[PDB]
C-alpha cells in the first residue's frame, strides 16, 4: 500500500486510489481475522459450510433459468 502523490492532481483522487489499493491488499480482513484464536476443527467446519453454500447457490441460480414466473 505505497502511494505517491503524482504531479498536479487533487487530493480526493489520491485518497480514493489509496483506498482501493488498501482494499485490494486485504489488510482489514487480516486484522479482523487474527483478532482471536480459532480451533482447527472450527476452521475446517466453516470451510466445508462455505463450499456447500457456494454449490447450492450456483445450482439454484442455474435451475431458475428453465422456469418462467408467468
Amino acid at each position: 500500500p505505497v502511494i505517491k502523490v503524482r504531479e498536479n492532481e487533487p487530493f480526493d483522487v489520491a485518497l480514493r486510489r489509496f483506498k482501493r489499493s488498501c482494499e485490494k491488499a486485504g489488510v482489514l480482513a487480516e486484522v479482523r481475522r487474527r483478532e482471536f484464536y480459532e480451533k482447527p476443527t472450527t476452521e475446517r467446519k466453516r470451510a466445508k459450510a462455505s463450499a456447500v453454500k457456494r454449490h447450492a447457490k450456483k445450482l439454484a441460480r442455474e435451475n431458475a433459468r428453465r422456469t418462467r414466473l408467468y
Binding site: 500500500p1 505505497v2 502523490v5 489509496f18
Partner: peptide, 9 residues
C-alpha cells in the same frame, strides 16, 4: 501539502 500515504499495520 500531502506527499505520500502508506499503510504500516
Amino acid at each position: 501539502r500531502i506527499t505520500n500515504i502508506t499503510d504500516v499495520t
